[PDB]
Every structure is written in C-alpha cells, then in structure tokens.
C-alpha cells in the first residue's frame, strides 16, 4: 500500500477490450499455443493498458492493449539464458528497432512485426516531430535490455541505487507508455513544454514511481530467481539494511515523489506562460497532466495489486 493521492480511472470500453484483447496477438504469430492464450489473459494486459488509456475507446484502446500485450511478450524473452547473453540480446533488440527506421524483411521474428505493427499504428496522424521523438524513447527502451543483459554476464550488480535508476528508468517502458496516451487521445503536448525542466521532473517521478512499485510487486519472482537487480536488494547492498528497512524506505520515498509531483503540478500554468502557449495548447498540456501522466501513475498503482503476473522462444526466432 502507498499514497497515490490521484482518482482511479478506467476506459468504460474495457470489457470490449479484454473480450477481443487475444485476436491481434494471435494474428502476429505472437500467441501460438492455448496455454500461452490462458497464461497471457492471467497477465492483465488489457485491464493495465484501459487504466494506462481511460480516454481511449476502441481502436485507439485496442492499440493500447496490443502495446500491453507486445510489451511484456517482448520481456518474456529475456527471463532465460537470452537475458544473460549481450551479444544475443542485442542480436533481438536490433531487429526489433528496426522498424523505427524502415520496413521489416519477412525474415524477421514475430515479435519484430509485432512492434512494427504498433509502431506503424501509433505513428499515423501525429505530426513527424512527435515520430520521431517517440522513435527515440523507443531506441532507449531496446539499449537498455542490452545494458541489463551486460550487468547479468559480467556479474556486475549494480552497486547503488543511483546506478540502478540510470538502468531501470529506460527498461521500465512508461516514456513509450505515456507516449501512446497522447496517441490514444489524438492529442499533443506542446513540445518545448516537453522538453522543459519541470516536465521532465513529473515525467521522471512517474518513471521512479513505476519501476519502484513493480521492484516491490515482483519481489518475490526475482528473489526465487537470484537476481540482485531489485530496488530493495540494492538497498540492502548499498546501505547494509535489513529487508524491512529498504521497503519502508520506498515506500517514504514514493510517498515524498508523490508530494512533489503534486508541487510541480501547480507550476504548470506558470510554465505555459514562459513559453506563450495559446489557450489550444494550455488545453494539450492539461490533457497531458492527466491523462498521460497522472494515468501512467495511478493506473500501475491499481493494476500492480490485482495482476495475476504477480515456450515463448518462437517469438525470437526468424
Ligand atoms: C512497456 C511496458 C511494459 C513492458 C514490460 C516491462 C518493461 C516490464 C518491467 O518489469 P520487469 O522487472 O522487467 O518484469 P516484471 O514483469 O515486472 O516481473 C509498459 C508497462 C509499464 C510498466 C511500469 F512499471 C510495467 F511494469
Ligand atoms: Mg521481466
Ligand atoms: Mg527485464
Ligand atoms: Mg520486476
């Protein structure tokens, strides 16, 4: 439990969303078997992408299900010996970023055109700037699965919780997330407010939130695997705390995120001054406040409790 002091919201399109979630998957080669079916609907995928979207109804919902769904299919394939390995990883990642750039050759794994097919999607009717800024976030998200498999092989755990951030802030996937809520809304930021200090403040508290509740919600599957690049065990290694400690401390440290995005909430119509937006985009910038980033915050919140997620080697096979 944490202090997440923004309302609840889900898209009343959900049921929809859930009852057709599997039929794209299924189509891209991306679910193969019934048991993988049945193990992919006990994720919650279509549940977490209507609370990440409540302002998305179909199509555009759907393309926040389908983001869900080849998001965590993508992360299933690094649980194994792939996760370990650099030089395999990013044999994958690099195929996958490849539709960033241009066409996929039919040779590519499924879950390549899988990623092509939401990116294609998610680019239509944005403007070229908006693309490609969203290219990049996308090309930071894949170079972080290969700085992680790096830490894995040289057995080099990360030694501090600032060391962690620097990784964990790309692999957790909300800057593409968040980026799809404009998507999803047929809505812009403006810009230069993106690219302002106190924009980036929110977003990287939305960012720290996240990767600190899935650190807590996963504890249990990645302290049953070994694996030392878990918030609470960097915590334990960087201050010598016991395992009470480390999760009270994220919880006050969420907390105090928390307060402050809320401060940095009321500054926004101060920002849009210092950068003259017209009345259109402080409504853009409005939209943004909440319902790409409060959304992205809330909605893991509530979805982190109620996920079940708390064989896929075709899918990275050309
Ligand atoms: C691109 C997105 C998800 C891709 C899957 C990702 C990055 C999952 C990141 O969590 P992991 O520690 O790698 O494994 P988990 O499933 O939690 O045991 C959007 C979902 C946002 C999240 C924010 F926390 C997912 F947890
Ligand atoms: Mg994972
Ligand atoms: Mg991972
Ligand atoms: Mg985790």
């Not at 991306?30 to 048991?35: M, P, T």
């Not at 539709?99 to 899988?114: F, K, V």
């Not at 290694?237 to 994220?250: D, F, L, P, T």
């Amino acid at each position: 439990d944490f202090h997440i002091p923004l309302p609840g919201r889900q898209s009343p399109d959900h049921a929809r969303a859930e009852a057709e979630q599997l039929a794209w998957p299924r189509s891209l080669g991306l679910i193969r078997s019934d048991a993988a079916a049945e193990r992919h609907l006990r994720g919650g995928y279509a549940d977490l992408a209507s609370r990440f979207y409540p302002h998305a109804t179909g199509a555009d919902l759907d393309l926040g299900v389908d983001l869900m769904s080849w998001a965590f299919l993508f992360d299933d394939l690094f649980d194994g010996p792939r996760g370990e390995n650099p030089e395999d990883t990013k044999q994958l990642t690099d195929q996958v970023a490849a539709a960033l750039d241009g066409p996929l050759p039919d040779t590519a794994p499924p879950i390549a055109h899988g990623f092509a097919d939401i990116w294609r999607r998610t680019c239509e009717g944005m403007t070229p700037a908006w693309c490609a800024r969203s290219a990049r976030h996308w090309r930071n998200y894949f170079d972080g699965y290969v700085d992680e498999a790096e830490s894995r092989f040289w057995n080099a755990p990360c030694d501090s919780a600032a060391q962690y951030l620097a990784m964990r802030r790309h692999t957790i996937g909300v800057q593409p997330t968040v980026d799809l809520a404009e998507r999803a809304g047929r809505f812009e930021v403006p810009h230069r407010v993106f690219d302002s200090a106190v924009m980036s403040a929110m977003l990287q508290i939305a960012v720290d939130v996240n990767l600190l509740l899935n650190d807590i919600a996963s504890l249990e599957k990645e302290e049953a695997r070994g694996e030392q690049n878990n918030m609470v065990m960097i915590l334990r290694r960087e201050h010598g705390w016991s395992k009470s400690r480390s999760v009270s401390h994220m919880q006050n440290e969420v907390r105090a995120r928390l307060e402050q995005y809320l401060l940095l909430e009321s500054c926004l119509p101060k920002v849009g001054e210092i950068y003259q937006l017209d009345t259109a985009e402080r409504e853009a910038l409005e939209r943004y406040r909440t319902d790409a980033v409060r959304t992205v915050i809330r909605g893991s919140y509530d979805w982190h409790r109620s996920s079940g997620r708390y064989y896929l080697e075709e899918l990275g096979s050309s």
